[PDB]
Amino acid sequence: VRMNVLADALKSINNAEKRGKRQVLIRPCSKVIVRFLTVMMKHGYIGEFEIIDDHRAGKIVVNLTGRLNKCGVISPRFDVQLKDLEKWQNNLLPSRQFGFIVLTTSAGIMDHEEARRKHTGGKILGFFF
Amino acid sequence: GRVRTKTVKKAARVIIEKYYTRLGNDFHTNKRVCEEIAIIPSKKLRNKIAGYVTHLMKRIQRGPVRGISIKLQEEERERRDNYVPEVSALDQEIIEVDPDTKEMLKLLDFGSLSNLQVTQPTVGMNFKTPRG
Amino acid sequence: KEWLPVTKLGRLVKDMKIKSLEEIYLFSLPIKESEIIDFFLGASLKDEVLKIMPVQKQTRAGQRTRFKAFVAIGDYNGHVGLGVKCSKEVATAIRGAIILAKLSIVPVRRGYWGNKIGKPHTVPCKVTGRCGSVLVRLIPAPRGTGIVSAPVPKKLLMMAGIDDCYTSARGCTATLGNFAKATFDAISKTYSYLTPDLWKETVFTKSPYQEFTDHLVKTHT
Amino acid sequence: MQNDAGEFVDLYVPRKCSASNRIIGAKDHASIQMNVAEVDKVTGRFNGQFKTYAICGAIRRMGESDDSILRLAKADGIVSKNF
Amino acid sequence: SGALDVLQMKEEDVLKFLAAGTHLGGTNLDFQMEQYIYKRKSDGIYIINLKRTWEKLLLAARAIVAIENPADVSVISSRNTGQRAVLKFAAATGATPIAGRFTPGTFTNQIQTAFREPRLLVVTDPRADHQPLTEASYVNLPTIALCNTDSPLRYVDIAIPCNNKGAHSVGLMWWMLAREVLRMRGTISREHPWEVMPDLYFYRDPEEIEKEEQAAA
Amino acid sequence: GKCRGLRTARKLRSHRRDQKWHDKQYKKAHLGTALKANPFGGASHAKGIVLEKVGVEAKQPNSAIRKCVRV
Amino acid sequence: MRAKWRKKRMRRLKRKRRKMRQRSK
Amino acid sequence: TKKRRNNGRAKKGRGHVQPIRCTNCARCVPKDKAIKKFVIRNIVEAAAVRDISEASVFDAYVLPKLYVKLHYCVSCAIHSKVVRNRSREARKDRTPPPRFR
RNA sequence: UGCUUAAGAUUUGAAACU
RNA sequence: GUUCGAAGACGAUCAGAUACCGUCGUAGUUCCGACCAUAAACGAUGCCGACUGGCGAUGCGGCGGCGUUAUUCCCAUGACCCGCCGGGCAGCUUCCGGGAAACCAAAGUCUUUGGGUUCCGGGGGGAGUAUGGUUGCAAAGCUGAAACUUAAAGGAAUUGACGGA
RNA sequence: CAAGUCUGGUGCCAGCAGCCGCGGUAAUUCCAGCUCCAAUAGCGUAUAUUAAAGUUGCUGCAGUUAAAAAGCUCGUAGUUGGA
Ligand SMILES: [Mg+2]
Ligand SMILES: [Mg+2]
Ligand SMILES: [Mg+2]
Ligand SMILES: [Mg+2]
Ligand SMILES: [Mg+2]
Ligand SMILES: [Mg+2]
Ligand SMILES: [Mg+2]
Ligand SMILES: [Mg+2]
Ligand SMILES: [Mg+2]
Ligand SMILES: [Mg+2]
Ligand SMILES: [Mg+2]
Ligand SMILES: [Mg+2]
Ligand SMILES: [Mg+2]
Ligand SMILES: [Mg+2]
Ligand SMILES: [Mg+2]
Ligand SMILES: [Mg+2]
Ligand SMILES: [Zn+2]
């Protein structure tokens, strides 16, 4: 069964691109996933989504544009200091121009370019480009 | 086995296509003509060519041919193309129209028509194919 | 010698009307004639024949050898081309494979590695590419790094001007037929790959088959 | 594609699709540019100006060309809103 | 193809649709073609929408009219039924048609006889005209097809849902597209009716032609 | 790998620590009785005393008698 | 040998080697 | 390599069926592997029914038939020329052979 | 409408762009 | 303890047959009771989890429906017919996608590499052998090396010659 | 893997060769001359070893047919556990 919902959603958002869809539905509503989608929205990879509320694990309907190559998820979760984040973006992204490793810290969920601002590191959740 | 070769088949046609009016039906007439409409070196090839030519002018006078273009018959085919009946075959009086096409006709612009002789819907649902 | 063209594109090239090869790669028109490319690029158009490969089959009397040929062609800035063709001997075959190499050239794309001063020299992202069981991965490089590769595609990347690039391979690289097509497919994907600078939507220009339809009719069929 | 001083250094901007938003290469010999003519609203003749559309190949061989044409024309003001 | 009162569907074209039978579909619905069909009958015949017939017919004559040269619009048919039809639509416009037995390689191989480079394909039926819908994917070509409610959309580009079995529907749908492309380029008035008959475009049995020779005189 | 947890180290290392023993160059060189049964004993030269001169045939396409010395 | 007759001859050799540890045990 | 998708038989969801003997040989074939012909046949072919129907007592006595359900193995079913091997591309057609001659 | 029909010494082949 | 029938005797066939062919035939084949735990035990494809195209079928439970069919006195139960839904063995068709290829709605979502989690392989032979333990009345089974020896052994498709096909 | 179809001898003999391969009466590969090459006061031959090896694989391997998933379920430790 489902040990990671965020890890069955970024694959359910991976299999709609290689087909060429427009809008898709995900079954559980995590607060992590919600802070994740509102990370990808600030960079404008996707459109504006919405959440559906029953009194359960709510649902989400995402609108998709055409700039989203591959959204991923790391398992398991690690700890990444400031001298490891270089050796992750060395060999987990295409180039140094774009792509966004995303990681939670004690300050909140943010990308690595921001983690350099705030001089902070913490546990990793995934990557998207 | 007397089977005529392709070198014969290819020369019977261009001669027909260019001298269709001049050719006839007797063998010894077009047997003399192909000597002076064509550079044929020998005699045996002469009599073989005209021998298959007088087999096509018989097949043509019996019907048309696939791979040869007849201009006299192109005129009759052109008129067979251009044949138009006088009275129209569409602007009739009675159009049998089912009530479910009446429905979407209601959802169209033309809500009422003139001569829609509506018919009965077929009771019993049997259109499929038995399995063996 | 005075090549007479057959097609609409050969007629439009004979009258010096289309000015470059960018309006063919902008439209993906099929290039079906060899003398266009020589008409544009006879200057810096070089050749490096890779390998002669004597394959053969069997009949009821001896065996029958027909030689296959690999030719890599291209300048050092902008375009590359490959050609493979087999015949009874090398004189005919090399001549008949330089043809298909001129008939199958593609544009390369190039970016930077981080800093953006000077001129573009490196591959914009990490690409891959494969044929058979050969998997070639191309990696971007910092300035002055040099070509880090095999002696075979160091020759083919040289014929694209890309000076600084790490490479990698996987599989049975001894087959030069495959390993060349793999390093050709890896560099034929670079204009099919989205970069978030390519976001500004395309303005649709007019077709050239539509821009020049008046003059073609009083010059040909 | 500007290095440090805004110089456009690539040799051509490629095309870009209109349905699935994934761009069309040079070797893609299964790509369409449609041309649909505008019409005046009182007579029904040809004005002279075009609406143009591009479609990449894998969608086309998949079989969804018309649903994109039908949506791009419905959104662009050709076909009435009932349909 | 709409948002206008002028270009609407007139009654004499409606009664000549219900007359010939371009509403009577096939039997097996295709999943790409759900949006044009109203309601399956008993006897299991699907009911088409004339509005979504006319919106596609007008979009086909828009694309064709916008094309400037009339002399590179090819039109292919192979069934025995619409040979006469695709030869008089091409007489009314000036198309360069192909009437049966499409020789392969004629779009891609230069040294053949009629090596042609067109810009638009129109096809009577895709099942039996499955060759050129493949030779449309090596040269960049749009495609129009006279689709039924049953045929697929492999490599087709705009579809016009019709009937394509009887001896009446193809000659009509070619005649109506002849009128609308002439009511589109300024050649023919729109208000007046077309002079000659859309019964020109039918198929005649080699029997019925031999039957109308005896009692004619 | 097949297990990917955060605290699965004694499973990984006690799986690699077994499956190394099925290598051939690790087992011959490292612990085992090959250094025991080397006639030199893990060295590069050895002196000897001749006792006889014999010859040995050669194998296939070839046909000769090579020369060997029992030591 | 196929494989079954090889497997059979091994068992006809082991029923001989345990026997040929006679007088010796 | 693997040559047919089902392995010549119909064992899809059981794991075991029972064996059935042939007729010419005695080779044991499981049931859904066998080639089951069904032979109905008159006791007179064509020309002796004229000489039965004349020498009978009753008025056109209808003759009986002889209903036999056969089986065959593989190498009898081929050595007696009922089935013939086919090309790979014309294996898949599993319609029965026609009934004209 | 089917009977039998064992065997055959060791060695010996390779292609370049102008 | 019917029928078949390892071992065995016998009659032919064959150069020779201790083999196939044919007559007889013990041990066994069947039943209850104690054991042994091995098979191409094969879909030669570990188990849970979803996800991403369709098209006809077939089987249980359920949801409606024109209409025939019997019960006749009809709602309701039975039999066909047209649809919907769950999961269960399957099938055609396809440029999703992959793969060395045959081929697969999974052997797919993999250099754009990470959903969780069990067992196991590291060239071929020597060899599933030696020894050491251990369960078993026996036959045998589970764990299970080396010494030496060799540059090929092997899988998928292509052409040719060949077949008492 | 840079560089002799040079000349004279043996004729599956004697021998070279890490690997493919050479030698049976004209050997570019053998013993010798001539010539030619690469490193240069240094160079080869053994052995131990690291990289190449994503052929020990945490980054980064395989398990239908090539080596490969226990015959089948249950099950305590362990490992991982929805909102
Ligand atoms: Mg791993
Ligand atoms: Mg096999
Ligand atoms: Mg079984
Ligand atoms: Mg017995
Ligand atoms: Mg015997
Ligand atoms: Mg027993
Ligand atoms: Mg027992
Ligand atoms: Mg198990
Ligand atoms: Mg081994
Ligand atoms: Mg082998
Ligand atoms: Mg050397
Ligand atoms: Mg080592
Ligand atoms: Mg391996
Ligand atoms: Mg195996
Ligand atoms: Mg097994
Ligand atoms: Mg087992
Ligand atoms: Zn049998």
Author numbering:
A (entry chain X2): 2 to 130
B (entry chain S2): 2 to 133
C (entry chain D2): 58 to 278
D (entry chain W2): 1 to 83
E (entry chain B2): 2 to 218
F (entry chain Y2): 2 to 72
G (entry chain n3): 1 to 25
H (entry chain b2): 2 to 102
What did the publication describing this PDB structure actually write?
Blasticidin S (BlaS) targets translation by binding to the peptidyl transferase center of the large ribosomal subunit. BlaS is a peptidyl-nucleoside antibiotic composed of a cytosine, a pyranose sugar ring, and an N-methyl-guanidine tail. To understand BlaS’ impact on mammalian translation termination, we solved the cryo-EM structure of ribosomal complexes with BlaS, eRF1, and eRF3a in the presence of GTP. All three structures have BlaS bound in the 60S peptidyl transferase center.
In class 2, called ‘Hybrid’ (29,879 particles, 3.8 Å resolution), tRNAs are bound in hybrid P/E and A/P states and no eRFs are bound. In the Hybrid and eRF-Bound cryo-EM structures, BlaS density is observed in the P-site of the 60S subunit at the same position. However, small differences are found in the positioning of BlaS’ cytosine and N-methyl-guanidine tail resulting in a slightly altered hydrogen bonding network and clearer base stacking with both C75 and A76 of the 3′CCA tail.
